[PDB]
């Protein structure tokens, strides 16, 4: 009844969750490149032509030329007023590169220091000067990840990104401030120098159909959205990357009926070395098309 | 924000959808106005300076998971990548 249907749902829910989770993980941190699977050849556009003629030596000339066609001064900030409905300290935040030991990117704070008017009336104006020395360098690029300005209600703004490009240009600024419409800080900054297949997935439990479905994106894996491009590739993908299930394909000229069922045969300390009983296994061994072996240096 | 639910609704099963907020504005010495857009989810995408006209068609940004900055993409979950073991006796 509803108790059996919930057991069906429960059976399919556990592997679906795993596969949908791995879809996220492996899209960022892969186990292997899908373009390298033999049943996924179509995935890779490119070929191995360049290689035979590629000369590693010629890279310098090409790189030196790219650099030749690519892109000092004090930074002064004048504060006009803080808007709300005050003491303003500016800092130079140096976020440094993480070294092996470090838990995270070390933050180095350099104080710059002043009193700025609260809700200053324009047409009633009668100033606050806070300049920054050339603490930035293309020399300490191996140490400092990025440079940023801290205003303190608080607000932050990067001066140079990771790829080290000046993004705080000369002009009239207005930044939004935050607790611990909207409090604002107003300043002036200057640098003073093709045919749809019908693919049905029938979910079987107790070896009889309990849920009949139809794929919306026909040759995409329903679990991980991989666009296999051929039915051949989709069936290999399913059977190998989703082995927690048994897939039973049934051919149709208009598409396919894939029967999904639960595979009931699915199945060190990390602290110091651990003794083991030597064991060898040969997972794959296939004769190569072109014989590459260095037979000249072979003993008898 | 549940990553799984988000990717399944907004993300079409493979992408993260970001929303911008104007956190700063500047008026150059030349007749041009630029805005500083801050992305939400935060701390994954960097702040980008954008033309006052360009605010629209940049209110949202859909990034495919394989296109997310890999250094910062791990902030999305404790088990995307982990150092096993974290604590090392030897090199």
């Amino acid at each position: 009844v509803q108790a059996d249907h919930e057991l069906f749902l429960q059976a399919f829910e556990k592997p679906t969750q795993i596969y949908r989770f791995l879809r996220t993980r492996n899209l960022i941190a892969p186990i292997f490149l899908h373009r390298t699977l033999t049943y996924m050849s179509h995935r890779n556009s490119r070929t191995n032509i360049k290689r035979k003629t590629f000369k590693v030596d010629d890279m310098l000339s090409k790189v030196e030329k790219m650099k030749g066609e690519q892109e000092s001064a004090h930074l002064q900030l004048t504060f006009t007023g803080f808007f709300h409905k005050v003491t303003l300290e500016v800092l130079l935040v140096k976020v440094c590169h993480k070294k092996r030991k470090d838990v995270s990117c070390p933050i180095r704070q350099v104080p710059t220091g002043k009193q700025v008017p609260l809700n200053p009336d324009l047409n009633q104006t009668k100033p606050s000067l806070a300049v920054s020395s050339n603490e930035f360098e293309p020399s300490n690029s191996h140490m400092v990840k990025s440079y940023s300005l801290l205003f303190r209600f608080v607000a932050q703004m990067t001066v140079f990104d990771k790829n080290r490009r000046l993004q705080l240009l000369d002009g009239e600024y207005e930044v939004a401030m935050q607790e611990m419409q909207g409090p604002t800080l107003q300043f002036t900054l200057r640098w003073t120098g093709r045919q749809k297949l019908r693919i049905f997935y029938q979910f079987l439990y107790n070896n009889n159909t309990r849920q009949q479905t139809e794929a919306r994106d026909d040759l995409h894996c329903p679990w991980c959205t991989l666009n296999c491009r051929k039915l051949y590739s989709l069936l290999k993908h399913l059977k190998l990357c989703h082995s927690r299930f048994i897939f039973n394909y049934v051919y149709h000229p208009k598409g396919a009926r894939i029967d999904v069922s639960i595979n009931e045969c699915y199945d060190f300390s990390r602290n110091g070395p651990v003794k083991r009983t030597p064991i060898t296994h040969i997972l794959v061994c296939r004769p190569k098309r072109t014989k590459a072996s260095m037979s000249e240096f072979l003993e008898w | 924000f549940n990553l799984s639910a988000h990717i399944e609704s907004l993300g079409k099963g493979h992408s993260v959808v970001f929303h911008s907020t104007v956190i700063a504005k500047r008026k150059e010495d030349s007749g041009k106005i630029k805005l500083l857009l801050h992305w939400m989810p935060e701390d994954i995408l960097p702040d980008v300076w954008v033309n006052e006209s360009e605010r629209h068609q940049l209110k949202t940004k859909v990034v495919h998971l394989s296109k997310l900055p890999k250094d910062t993409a791990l902030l999305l979950d404790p088990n995307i990548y982990r150092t096993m073991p974290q604590k090392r006796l030897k090199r």
């Binding site: 829910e13 969750q17 479905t213 794929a215 329903p222 | 399944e8």
Partner: peptide
């Protein structure tokens, strides 16, 4: 028409 496979599987996660 039948429910879509991708929606069935999504249902299964969000539970």
């Amino acid at each position: 028409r039948k429910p879509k496979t991708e929606d069935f599987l999504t249902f299964l996660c969000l539970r």
